[PDB]
Amino acid sequence: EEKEILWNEAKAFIAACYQELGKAAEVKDRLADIKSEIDLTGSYVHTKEELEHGAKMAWRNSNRCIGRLFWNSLNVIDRRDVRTKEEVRDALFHHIETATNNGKIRPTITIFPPEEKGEKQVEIWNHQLIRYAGYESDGERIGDPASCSLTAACEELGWRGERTDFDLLPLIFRMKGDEQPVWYELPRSLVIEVPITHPDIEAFSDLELKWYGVPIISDMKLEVGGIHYNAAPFNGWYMGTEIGARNLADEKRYDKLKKVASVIGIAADYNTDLWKDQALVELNKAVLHSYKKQGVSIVDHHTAASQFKRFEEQAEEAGRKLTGDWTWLIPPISPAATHIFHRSYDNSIVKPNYFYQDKPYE
Ligand code: HEM
Ligand SMILES: Nc1ccc2ccc(COc3cccc(CNCc4ccccn4)c3)cc2n1
Ligand SMILES: [Cl-]
Structure with a gap:
């Protein structure tokens, strides 16, 4: 029905990805194999090398991110093998521990199975894996207002917060084939x-x-060569x-x-x-x-803005166009003391990239 959109995304991505990995000779055979796979099955499966480099490309293309100088050192964890709630939970626990690294934070993404044909295999409800609850009752405000709607969804499901100003929300996610999400409290030992x-x-x-x-932003979709990884939490510092x-x-x-x-x-x-x-x-x-x-x-x-200036210089030296969102790159404190404020940026969307998606709670 819609297979050719996938096939064209796959050509643009594989071409560009192999180019940069110094492997353009392998392109023609890899596109053949992919064409076969799409016809028989309706989709294709990335190699470990394609997935790692695709997630790095997606960070490099994130117009609103001042921190992109370090795009090539992203730690990519391949969790396309998970099938159960306990495996999802434990991969999310592992992400926290390995990204935290005792305070010497490692930029990391964990990639779960992609949408199959529109259908999500795993649906994460948290906006970040670590975030504080918010409450609004009797005109009495407690904790983080941005968390009020998720906190109310969590409490319909049997979670109850202590109503401090800094309650840790539980991990909350839904598996394909369940009507309801599950939730798990975060072990405090994991949270600095x-x-x-x-x-x-x-x-x-x-x-x-x-x-x-x-x-640890946990509600964005990673798109690479036509494959839609709706569950792929990532973090910087x-x-x-x-x-x-x-x-x-x-x-x-x-x-x-x-x-x-x-x-x-x-x-x-x-x-x-x-x-x-x-x-x-x-x-x-x-x-x-x-x-x-x-x-x-x-x-x-x-x-951070000094680092971003070096990112801009690398892009030119590599012959890549730079894209950027001026209104998000400038900082909210003393913006005109950075070079960013004094130039302009093309806001075009280049793929692979990270994208917004609709929240499952209201
Ligand atoms: C390594 C340290 C990093 C720093 C210091 C950094 C800094 C930032 C900042 C300040 C924002 C603006 C958010 C705001 O206005 O509150 C942002 C946006 C963003 N960053 Fe980075 N970032 C880093 C790593 C990453 C990583 C590892 C990725 C993905 C692999 C990423 C992808 C993005 C994306 C997609 C946005 C836009 C989000 C949106 O539209 O809502 N960043 N970054
Ligand atoms: N260190 C890091 C590292 C990675 C990050 C990835 C994503 C984000 C998301 O961030 C925001 C999301 C929603 C709203 C806001 C604040 N509004 C920004 C704004 C508003 C109006 C005009 C211009 N900008 C941020 C953060 C990351 N941070
Ligand atoms: Cl934040």
Whole structure:
């Protein structure tokens, strides 16, 4: 019905992939074998080398990612062999442990079986594997507002949170052929967390802030040569502004800037005092200090943009077009102090790539 879309994606991908692996001679025979396989079966199966390089290409093509200099060192874990809930659960546990690496974070992706002919083999409900619950009741707000809808789905299924501001959500996923997902609590031994302190202001610890070490995005689809890997969680390390300027600062997230102003001893009364700006800087200083003192990988937005400049230079030196989303590449703190702010970027979509997909809860 729709097999030729798959076949053409497969030609573009195999051509480009082998080219770069210095293997263009093997292309003609590999496309033959693929053409056979699609006719008989309706799909094809990537080699380990094709899958690893495809997931690396997909990171290199992610327009919104400032961290792409390191695209070629992605650790790719091939879990297309899993068939049971316990195997999925244990592969997700293993990803956390091996990506964390005692604080010296390793960018890692774990790839589960792809969609067969539209049908998902495994459907992950978490937005990240490690994330905090959020609650809204009696006009009383607890934890992370961005997690309210998933937290309510989890509690229909029999999970119950302690209603701290930092409850760890359970892993939640559904297998092909079950009506309902299963959930598993995270073993705390697997989860590194960082208390937020400030290098100079001893009272900052009175805020009792913390964040988790590793962001493991678990709800995006990886597409490589026409095959759709809807379950393929991946992680880098944080850039500090993600925690200090957004997760802990936004009014619709933890909304901590007024409390920060008070502990650093400035008034939060007049826009012209730039008290929100000053609080943002001190919170973001505290976040970088805290991760570094605990030995957990993190990058500041200036170093990150320096790395991205080198990515842009490599792309040219290799003859590849650069694509990028200016509105996501600029950092939310001092953007005009980076080179990114002062140039433009072509936002075209190149494949392999990571894509959004509809959430299964509401
Ligand atoms: C190694 C360290 C990494 C750093 C520091 C980094 C940094 C970032 C940042 C700051 C964003 C913006 C998110 C926001 O505004 O909150 C982002 C987006 C993104 N990153 Fe990276 N990243 C890294 C690794 C990775 C890896 C390993 C992949 C996949 C293999 C990846 C794929 C993406 C994608 C797809 C987006 C866009 C997500 C969306 O549209 O919602 N990144 N990255
Ligand atoms: N260290 C890392 C490493 C990898 C990452 C992969 C994906 C993401 C996803 O990130 C976001 C998703 C949704 C919303 C936001 C914040 N809104 C950004 C925005 C809004 C308006 C205008 C411009 N930008 C981020 C993060 C990763 N982080
Ligand atoms: Cl985050």
